[PDB]
Design an enzyme around this catalytic site. Structure first.
Site, mmCIF file in Angstrom:
data_model
loop_
_atom_site.group_PDB
_atom_site.id
_atom_site.type_symbol
_atom_site.label_atom_id
_atom_site.label_comp_id
_atom_site.label_asym_id
_atom_site.label_seq_id
_atom_site.Cartn_x
_atom_site.Cartn_y
_atom_site.Cartn_z
ATOM 1 N N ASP A 228 -48.029 49.402 -46.333
ATOM 2 C CA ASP A 228 -48.425 50.790 -46.544
ATOM 3 C C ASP A 228 -47.375 51.758 -47.026
ATOM 4 O O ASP A 228 -47.104 52.740 -46.354
ATOM 5 C CB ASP A 228 -49.007 51.353 -45.260
ATOM 6 C CG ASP A 228 -50.258 50.644 -44.846
ATOM 7 O OD1 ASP A 228 -51.241 50.673 -45.625
ATOM 8 O OD2 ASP A 228 -50.246 50.046 -43.747
ATOM 9 N N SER B 252 -59.012 47.093 -38.430
ATOM 10 C CA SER B 252 -59.884 48.057 -39.090
ATOM 11 C C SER B 252 -59.096 49.302 -39.504
ATOM 12 O O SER B 252 -57.897 49.222 -39.811
ATOM 13 C CB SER B 252 -61.032 48.453 -38.159
ATOM 14 O OG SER B 252 -60.524 48.880 -36.909
ATOM 15 N N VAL C 268 -59.178 40.951 -38.052
ATOM 16 C CA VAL C 268 -57.889 41.186 -37.400
ATOM 17 C C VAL C 268 -57.623 42.668 -37.217
ATOM 18 O O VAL C 268 -56.662 43.039 -36.550
ATOM 19 C CB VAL C 268 -56.690 40.597 -38.189
ATOM 20 C CG1 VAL C 268 -56.522 39.130 -37.862
ATOM 21 C CG2 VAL C 268 -56.892 40.792 -39.676
ATOM 22 N N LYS D 81 -58.161 42.561 -47.343
ATOM 23 C CA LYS D 81 -58.609 43.890 -46.972
ATOM 24 C C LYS D 81 -59.788 44.298 -47.831
ATOM 25 O O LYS D 81 -59.748 44.209 -49.062
ATOM 26 C CB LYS D 81 -57.481 44.911 -47.132
ATOM 27 C CG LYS D 81 -57.948 46.346 -47.179
ATOM 28 C CD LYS D 81 -56.983 47.311 -46.487
ATOM 29 C CE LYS D 81 -55.659 47.474 -47.219
ATOM 30 N NZ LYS D 81 -54.855 48.586 -46.625
ATOM 31 N N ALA E 104 -59.709 53.710 -41.145
ATOM 32 C CA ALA E 104 -60.579 54.565 -41.958
ATOM 33 C C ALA E 104 -60.501 54.239 -43.454
ATOM 34 O O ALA E 104 -61.277 54.766 -44.256
ATOM 35 C CB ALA E 104 -60.231 56.038 -41.720
ATOM 36 N N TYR E 105 -59.565 53.361 -43.811
ATOM 37 C CA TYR E 105 -59.346 52.935 -45.192
ATOM 38 C C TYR E 105 -60.101 51.630 -45.537
ATOM 39 O O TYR E 105 -60.410 51.370 -46.701
ATOM 40 C CB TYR E 105 -57.834 52.746 -45.419
ATOM 41 C CG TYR E 105 -57.203 51.711 -44.489
ATOM 42 C CD1 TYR E 105 -57.415 50.347 -44.682
ATOM 43 C CD2 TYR E 105 -56.455 52.103 -43.387
ATOM 44 C CE1 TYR E 105 -56.908 49.409 -43.807
ATOM 45 C CE2 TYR E 105 -55.942 51.170 -42.508
ATOM 46 C CZ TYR E 105 -56.175 49.820 -42.717
ATOM 47 O OH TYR E 105 -55.687 48.875 -41.831
ATOM 48 N N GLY E 106 -60.396 50.820 -44.526
ATOM 49 C CA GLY E 106 -61.087 49.570 -44.762
ATOM 50 C C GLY E 106 -60.747 48.567 -43.679
ATOM 51 O O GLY E 106 -59.829 48.793 -42.892
ATOM 52 N N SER E 107 -61.480 47.459 -43.630
ATOM 53 C CA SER E 107 -61.231 46.439 -42.627
ATOM 54 C C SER E 107 -60.354 45.322 -43.152
ATOM 55 O O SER E 107 -60.193 45.163 -44.364
ATOM 56 C CB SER E 107 -62.544 45.859 -42.132
ATOM 57 O OG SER E 107 -63.288 46.840 -41.439
ATOM 58 N N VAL E 108 -59.797 44.538 -42.236
ATOM 59 C CA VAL E 108 -58.930 43.429 -42.615
ATOM 60 C C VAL E 108 -59.339 42.118 -41.948
ATOM 61 O O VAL E 108 -59.759 42.098 -40.789
ATOM 62 C CB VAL E 108 -57.472 43.745 -42.255
ATOM 63 C CG1 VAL E 108 -56.596 42.553 -42.496
ATOM 64 C CG2 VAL E 108 -56.999 44.912 -43.089
HETATM 65 C C1 LIG Z 1 -54.544 43.026 -47.073
HETATM 66 C C2 LIG Z 1 -53.602 44.120 -47.204
HETATM 67 C C3 LIG Z 1 -53.779 44.911 -48.408
HETATM 68 C C4 LIG Z 1 -52.961 46.073 -48.720
HETATM 69 C C5 LIG Z 1 -51.932 46.428 -47.763
HETATM 70 C C6 LIG Z 1 -51.005 47.587 -48.086
HETATM 71 O O1 LIG Z 1 -49.981 47.751 -47.435
HETATM 72 N N1 LIG Z 1 -51.297 48.427 -49.076
HETATM 73 C C7 LIG Z 1 -50.379 49.462 -49.390
HETATM 74 C C8 LIG Z 1 -49.055 49.084 -49.848
HETATM 75 C C9 LIG Z 1 -49.990 49.687 -50.776
HETATM 76 C C10 LIG Z 1 -51.771 45.628 -46.552
HETATM 77 C C11 LIG Z 1 -52.580 44.463 -46.229
HETATM 78 C C12 LIG Z 1 -52.421 43.839 -44.931
HETATM 79 C C13 LIG Z 1 -53.081 44.514 -43.820
HETATM 80 C C14 LIG Z 1 -52.920 44.028 -42.451
HETATM 81 C C15 LIG Z 1 -52.125 42.853 -42.076
HETATM 82 N N2 LIG Z 1 -51.953 42.428 -40.736
HETATM 83 C C16 LIG Z 1 -51.141 41.319 -40.399
HETATM 84 N N3 LIG Z 1 -50.968 41.025 -39.024
HETATM 85 C C17 LIG Z 1 -51.988 40.342 -38.318
HETATM 86 C C18 LIG Z 1 -51.620 39.866 -36.994
HETATM 87 N N4 LIG Z 1 -51.988 40.775 -35.973
HETATM 88 C C19 LIG Z 1 -51.073 41.813 -35.651
HETATM 89 C C20 LIG Z 1 -51.767 42.861 -34.915
HETATM 90 O O2 LIG Z 1 -52.596 42.301 -34.008
HETATM 91 C C21 LIG Z 1 -53.561 41.419 -34.330
HETATM 92 C C22 LIG Z 1 -53.002 40.314 -35.094
HETATM 93 N N5 LIG Z 1 -50.503 40.622 -41.454
HETATM 94 C C23 LIG Z 1 -50.659 41.023 -42.804
HETATM 95 C C24 LIG Z 1 -51.474 42.163 -43.198
HETATM 96 C C25 LIG Z 1 -51.629 42.661 -44.568
#
Ligand SMILES: Cc1ccc(C(=O)NC2CC2)cc1-c1ccc2nc(NCCN3CCOCC3)ncc2c1
Length: 356
Positions: A172, A36, A34, A57, A38-42
């Site tokens: 984040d 990417s 879903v 992630k 520079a911190y890692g992929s999702v």
């Molecule tokens: C796994 C994770 C780990 C850590 C953190 C984090 O904030 N760490 C910081 C606080 C300390 C965040 C996530 C994370 C990442 C991406 C995410 N993306 C969506 N939307 C997907 C639908 N889309 C929208 C765009 O277009 C394509 C489809 N939903 C939930 C998510 C959760």
């Protein structure tokens, strides 16, 4: 009393995704990329163990340098601490490694949200009620995040995730890791931050985040970016035209000398009339915005004060706007080696207890 003598190690499986190998526990199925960065992929996936749709992630090269190593620890701690509805929390965190020696990867599992605030706005116009519920939750979240003495520093629409039923979570927070060249030019990254933290003035407090919330709500109401500047200076000017130039009072409180020195030289101008900019807006909203968009951070409304504002009257429930325990960030003032940050991180992983 009862104790767990031996913890069982789930059985993982590999598969290539995003040109990178993903080894995860068999509970997670249907992994689909879903995003990417520079911190890692999702990857979005389905957690058969809980029946929840989750976001996973995989950090990329988490211990490749002290700066990365420490940040990898920092993120795990932040996620472990947050346990609130409107703040992204940790549902699971695993590593395929069988011991500290092997240890190389870290996967963080979280809830999955349909979209981020960008996507939504493009899809339709939101009702005054939508704005209320959307902004109301951002404030509930911030109240909680701030109470654990944590500042977001970079709140913007791409960090706010919502879904079908208009529910929102904040992502984040407390990471503040950006190189100056991505915040230069006509970029949306630098359009929602407080001027104090943008031009490094005095020190900043939790209210930098309240300023961002102001810029977002303005946008959700008007349907246009409030301060879409072309660079740090153009950006500052757009802001000053609306809120007015600094005043003696706030000007002295600006710790930085070069900054304080530049502000002075700016031609002065009064605060515009907010009712003439955010037109067709619930009048109560206009009032809340005039309390969120003030140059001096010492006089900006706080998240808890703002929940009490008449605009959120249909959603405000004091007996349901939780606060967090204090976050222990002493580790933040340490200088350790990659292996020491790694080791600490490793400990935080094998000691993670899944939510109920
Ligand atoms: C796994 C994770 C780990 C850590 C953190 C984090 O904030 N760490 C910081 C606080 C300390 C965040 C996530 C994370 C990442 C991406 C995410 N993306 C969506 N939307 C997907 C639908 N889309 C929208 C765009 O277009 C394509 C489809 N939903 C939930 C998510 C959760």
């Amino acid at each position: 009393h009862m104790l767990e003598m031996s913890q069982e190690r789930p059985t993982f499986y590999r598969q290539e995704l995003n040109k990178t190998i993903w080894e995860v526990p068999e509970r997670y199925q249907n992994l689909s990329p879903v995003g990417s960065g520079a911190y890692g992929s999702v990857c979005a996936a389905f957690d058969t163990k809980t029946g929840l749709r989750v976001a996973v992630k995989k950090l990329s090269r988490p211990f490749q340098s002290i700066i990365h190593a420490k940040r990898t620890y920092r993120e795990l701690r932040l996620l472990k601490h947050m346990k609130h509805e409107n703040v992204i929390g940790l549902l699971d965190v695993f590593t395929p490694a069988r011991s500290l020696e092997e240890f190389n990867d870290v996967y963080l599992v979280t809830h999955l949200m349909g979209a981020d605030l960008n996507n939504i706005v493009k899809c339709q116009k939101l009702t005054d009620d939508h704005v209320q519920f959307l902004i109301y939750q951002i404030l509930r979240g911030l109240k909680y995040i701030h109470s654990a003495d944590i500042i977001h520093r970079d709140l913007k629409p791409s960090n706010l995730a919502v879904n079908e039923d208009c529910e929102l979570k904040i992502l984040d927070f407390g990471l503040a890791r950006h190189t100056d060249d991505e915040m230069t030019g006509y970029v949306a990254t630098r359009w929602y931050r407080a001027p104090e933290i943008m031009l490094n003035w005095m020190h900043y407090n939790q209210t930098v985040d309240i300023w961002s919330v102001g810029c977002i709500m303005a946008e959700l109401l008007t349907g246009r970016t409030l301060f879409p500047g072309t660079d740090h200076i153009d950006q500052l000017k757009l802001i000053l035209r609306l809120v007015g130039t600094p005043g003696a009072e706030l000007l002295k409180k600006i710790s930085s000398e070069s900054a304080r020195n530049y502000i002075q030289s700016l031609t002065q101008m009064p605060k515009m009339n907010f009712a003439n900019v955010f037109i067709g807006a619930n009048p109560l909203a206009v009032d809340l915005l005039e309390k969120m968009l003030v140059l001096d951070s010492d006089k900006r409304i706080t998240a808890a004060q703002a929940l009490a504002h008449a605009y959120f009257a249909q959603y405000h429930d004091p007996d349901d706007e939780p606060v967090a325990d204090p976050y222990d960030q002493s580790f933040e003032s340490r200088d350790l080696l990659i292996d020491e940050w790694k080791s600490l991180t490793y400990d935080e992983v094998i000691s993670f207890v899944p939510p109920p």
